[PDB]
Design a protein around this nucleic acid. Structure first.
Lengths: 66, 65, 63, 53
DNA sequence: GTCGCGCGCAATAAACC
DNA sequence: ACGGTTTATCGCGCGCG
């Protein structure tokens, strides 16, 4: 499952403290938004990503938790 | 191309019986995003008829004149 | 519940059996149509409003 | 008429036997009534429910 | 076994003013 | 040398086995 590696790679190259939407990830990475959101919610559960509230939700690399 | 594939499948089901987009996405091997995108367009062109529900049911358009 | 009151008041200011569109509510309140529809459809599931399917949908006070 | 009976009577799973209703229809009225302010969802596995006074 | 989901929605077309 | 902006059931939050 190298879909996790490319998303974390994309959020790293986006910049410091930068966030983006799941619809934007589906467009750039060329991956259906269905698989994207399934991985995004999974990476936030692993603690590697954090979800900013909003519609749609914004996603960035987690900074706070251990 | 994808539309007639959905239409052809709804023929071999017996007139009266319907199906869901989730059921179509598996049989035709197509993501449900494209399935629903074609289904809603076939009902707007009069080719199909939508029975709204949870989830909605789709069948051949029935004339009502 | 603040934008909900602005919409509910207007639908009450306007006729006691009348309806209106989200576009009409958008201009008469200086609020984008996206924010209006967010409140309109939310009020429908709460049973506060009644929606008439159409182009565009019509919204009126329910009981 | 489910919205009326769901108030007179926990988990949505537990409500499937007390009323003989599928869990899909119970969670429907639960999240709907919770958006009407009358319910409140607890963080359980499965989640827990209770009437909000 | 969390799940309530109805979703098609624009990497659009068409219509408006 | 050139039609920008809004609509559409357009509300969408959806990840669901």
């Amino acid at each position: 499952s190298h879909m996790e590696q490319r998303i974390l790679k994309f959020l790293e190259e986006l910049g410091e403290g930068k966030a983006t939407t799941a619809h934007d990830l589906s467009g750039k990475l060329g991956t259906p938004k269905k698989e994207i959101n399934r991985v995004l919610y999974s990476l936030a559960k692993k603690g590697k990503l954090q979800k900013e509230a909003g519609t749609p939700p914004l996603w960035k690399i987690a900074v706070s938790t251990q």
